[PDB]
Amino acid sequence: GYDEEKVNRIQGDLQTVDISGVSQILKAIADENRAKITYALCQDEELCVCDIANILGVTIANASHHLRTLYKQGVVNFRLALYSLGDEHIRQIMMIALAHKKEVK
């Protein structure tokens, strides 16, 4: 084969982490509208579903659907239901991707 020891070791490294779960969580945030929601909750502490539907310019059903999806991945929490960021890890991923996207070259 080719570089089998290094390759087998990195496959091992991948097998020991939930790369699948990373893909799910990033996919949830990556949706245009869910990314807007996530950014919106980085700025205001809590929003209700109607605020979110109006901000996004989408139906209340669509916003509910988007919040359900974020909720399943811990991206948002709820406490009328008011939504907030799941935790500080979500805030940091947002701010880091935004910083990275401003770089030149």
Residues of this chain that interact with a copy of itself (CB under 8 A) are 1-4, 6-7, 9-11, 13-14, 17-27, 29-32, 35-36, 39-40, 43-44, 47, 50-51, 54-55, 74, 86-87, 89-90, 92-94, 96-103
Instruction: List gaps in the chain by the residue before each (C–N > 2.5 Å).
Output: 79
The Cα 86–Cα 82 span in angstroms is 12
Is residue 87 a contact residue for Zn ion (CB under 5 A)? yes
Q: Does 89 interact with Zn ion (rule: CB under 5 A)?
A: yes
CB-nearer residue toward Zn ion: 50 or 97? 97
Give the shortest CB-70-to-a copy of itself separation in angstroms: 12
By C-alpha distance, which of 27, 23, 53, 22 is closest to 40?
53
Q: What are the tokens at 69?
A: 């999806």
The site partner of 71 among a copy of itself, Zn ion, none (C-beta below 5 to 8 Å per kind) is none
Cβ 57 to a copy of itself, closest distance in Å? 8
Q: Where are the alpha helices (DSSP H) in the chain?
A: 4-15, 19-30, 32-43, 49-56, 60-72, 88-101
User: Which residues contact Zn ion by CB under 5 A?
Assistant: 87, 89, 100, 103
